[PDB]
Amino acid sequence: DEVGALSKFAASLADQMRAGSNSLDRDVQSLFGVWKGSAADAYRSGWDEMQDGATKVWNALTDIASTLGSNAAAF
Amino acid sequence: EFSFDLDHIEQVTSRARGFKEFVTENLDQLESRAQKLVQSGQWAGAAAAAYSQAHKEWMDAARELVEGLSQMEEAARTAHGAY
């Protein structure tokens, strides 16, 4: 049952990370309408790296969630 | 002195920090429960390989997520005068 529980946990966290990431992306992009210069530029590339990390996490969570849900027997 | 725009930057950065904390807390909980299963032997062979692969991906990604946030924080600091 812990296997089913972890599949649901990973899947739920994936859904929340995707939402959170998209929400933050909108917020971050809205700053650049007024914020200009070298710190704005560095912030933009920090966020690009953060969002990239978030995507890779979401993908890994979805993968293990699916494998645990669909191949429950091997676990 | 401290414009609306700088407060806005600080609020967004604060949401990004909340997000990072949320992500690491829950990956921690997942790793802790899953690692028990590998430890007990209930997850062995292909099962362990699958976990190990996903865990490698999210761990390296979590690091990238924190390094990105660190860059955002240094930038926001720079904007506030904390050079």
Numbering used by the authors:
A (entry chain A): 2 to 76
B (entry chain B): 8 to 90
Give verbatim lines from the article.
The overall architecture of the complexes is similar to known Esx structures in that each heterodimer forms a four helix bundle with the CFP-10 and ESAT-6 subunit homologs each contributing an α-helical hairpin to the complex. The subunit interfaces in the four-helix bundles of the Esx complexes are similar to those of the previously determined Esx complex structures in that the intermolecular interface between the CFP-10 and ESAT-6 subunits is largely hydrophobic.
Using this expression approach we expressed and purified six Esx complexes and determined the crystal structures of M. abscessus EsxEF (EsxEFma), encoded by the MAB_3112 and MAB_3113 genes, M. smegmatis EsxGH (EsxGHms), encoded by the MSMEG_0620 and MSMEG_0621 genes, and M. tuberculosis EsxOP (EsxOPmt), encoded by the Rv2346c and Rv2347c genes, at resolutions of 1.96 Å, 2.70 Å, and 2.55 Å, respectively. Three additional Esx complexes (EsxGHma, EsxEFma, and EsxTUma) from M. abscessus, a fast-growing pathogen, were cloned into pMAPLe4, an expression vector similar to pMAPLe3 with the exception that the MBP moiety is cleaved from the CFP-10 passenger by TVMV protease leaving a TEV protease cleavable His6 tag on the N-terminus of the CFP-10 subunit. The substitution of an N-terminal cleavable tag on the CFP-10 subunit in lieu of the C-terminal His6 tag on the ESAT-6 subunit was deemed to be more amenable to generating a well ordered crystal lattice as the number of potentially disordered amino acid residues is reduced. The WXG-containing loops are well ordered in the EsxGHms complexes and in most of the EsxEFma complexes but the majority of the connecting loops are disordered in the EsxOPmt subunit structures.
